[PDB]
Each structure stands twice: as structure tokens, then as C-alpha cells.
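Subject: Predicted fold for Maltose-binding periplasmic protein, 370 residues

User T.R. writes:
Posting the sequence so we have a shared reference for the thread.
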Amino acid sequence: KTEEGKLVIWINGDKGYNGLAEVGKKFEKDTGIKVTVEHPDKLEEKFPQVAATGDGPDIIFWAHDRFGGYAQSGLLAEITPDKAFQDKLYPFTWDAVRYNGKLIAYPIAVEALSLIYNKDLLPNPPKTWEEIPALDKELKAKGKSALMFNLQEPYFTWPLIAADGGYAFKYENGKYDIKDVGVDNAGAKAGLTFLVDLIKNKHMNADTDYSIAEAAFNKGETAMTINGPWAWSNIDTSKVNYGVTVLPTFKGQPSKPFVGVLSAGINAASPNKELAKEFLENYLLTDEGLEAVNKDKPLGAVALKSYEEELAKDPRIAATMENAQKGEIMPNIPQMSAFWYAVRTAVINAASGRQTVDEALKDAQTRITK
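User M.O. replies:
I've generated the C-alpha cells; pasting them so everyone works from the same file.
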């Protein structure tokens, strides 16, 4: 079991694990509060199991989507931000930390799958999706690919389909309708046909993934590639000039990429609402803490409006915020789980040629709103 007069921050061994430790060494010097950081494995289910008693850690960090899993059952602590706390953060970001109007979190850092390309062979990046296909024919002539990604998750092919006009839930009346899915839409039906015809015309590869796509960029094969916030960590010794740019457009329409924010969590038992709220307010959501963790592990964009500028100094970061602003945040409802499964077989069933485009979206629609 944990004790008082201390702070235990849990990390996924890949997100400011060493940088966060620095902030702790300062806290103790300012007051004397202990600050430990651990990165266990499979702590997803092991976290809420012990959290119920309050013996495990105290503070947790996860996406807004998952943040709505421990509170739904009643295994999280509430909150009470001030005008400066609610003003510093963005309105939309707050929507991610809310179940039924009640607030049980406070977003700090924001992340999202942006476009990472190299300025070695391709100086000018493709602003439109229709411009990539042509490159696939040229870049291939030399003996290299143009752009790849993870073909094992509809989420990766969302900005291409959802962009044309497709969603999972309908945001209305304050909440998101569960009996209203946007899969078999006029736009979505055509969106998929794009990626589909590609693999059919030998424009892409079937054996494509985030890993295989990550190495192709490191070795210097593909000019462009899409990866998460855990890509910058890879580069350090090779020193590869990376470029962050918002996802292209389709038919003159904005992309509909997902949103991935990073908020802090607190237990209802008795972790440290006084120290945690103070450490996260004046030692995490400020240049003193953010810059400290960013120096070792720059998460990228954040919710803090003030820090949004200092970070916006370079378009590389400006593109991150634009991805979340134009993108769409995932609701905090349990129905979202069913969507992860339905959509999974949907895209796969289409690519494999087991079900038509309209059929894949039709069946999935019934599965989600079943």
C-alpha cells in the first residue's frame, strides 16, 4: 500500500519517464515531497484492480478515451479547477474529460498521428491525398515507396474515409447518439473505394504496418510515413530531419483524424489531491514542468494556451494542434468498444474481398447499434 507525503506517477515506459523524474527532485527541494515513478507491464487491468483499495499507485496517465473506463464504474477521484485552470485549457479538450457533464480529469498534453516525411528526396510534401497516388508511380520508378502506414486498424484509414463523410457516432443534444453511426454514408462509401482500388491496382502493399513502416523511414526508403508520438524517441543518433504536417485533404474537404490527449488521473481512495493538484498545476501544466519534461521527451502539443504559443514557435508543433482541432475526439461511452470490433472486420472484410464496401459498413452499423 502507498503512504502519505509522497507522489507516485505511473508511466508506460515511453513518455517522459526520465524527464518526469526531474520535476520530482525539484518538488522535494521546494517542500520535501517524495516523487517516485514506475512503469509496470499490463498495468491496464492491474491498475483499477488495486486502485479500488488504494494500495497501488496514486496518479495515473492515459488517453481521454480510456479515462472514461475507471470513472464509469466508480474507481476515480473528482476534481475542482479554478477560473485560471479552466481558462488555461481549451474548451474542446475539456469535452474529452467528461462523462455526463461531470468533470473527473484535466487534459495537459495533446498528441496525434501526424504526417512525418523526410527532406532528403522529397522536399515538397503532398498537401492533397490525390497527389500521393501519382508519387507512388514515380517514387517507385527509382526503387522506393512514396507513403505507407498501418493497414491493420481502420483508425489509420479514418482521415481518408471519415473525411469524405463518415463517423461512428452523432454528436447531438450534448451527447453522442449511439443509434446513429456514419459508416455507410455517401462519402464513406466512396472513401473506402479509394484505398480499396489502391491495393487492387498494386499501388500499396498488403504486408504494411506501423513497425515495418517505421523502419522504412529510418533506413531511408519511403519519403513519407505516419507514426504516433513515440517516433521521435527513435531518432537521436542518426539525426534525421523530420517534418510534421497535418493530414492532406480529399475533394477540398478537411480530414477527420482521431484525437489523442494526455490527462492526469486521481484515485478516490486517498492518493494526494492536495499535492497532486498542486504538482500538476504548478509543476506540470507550466513552463517549469512542461519544459522540464519536453527537454527529455517532447510530447508535442498541449492543452495549455500559454504553452501552446511557446510550442507553436515552430510549425512542426503547430501541425499537432491543428490535427486535434480539425480531427474528432472519441466519446467516453462503452459503446465505443463495439465500434472498435465492428469497424475492424469491416475494413478487413473489404480489403480481403469477403464483403462489399456497402456491406462492410452496413453490417458494422448494425453491430454498433445492436
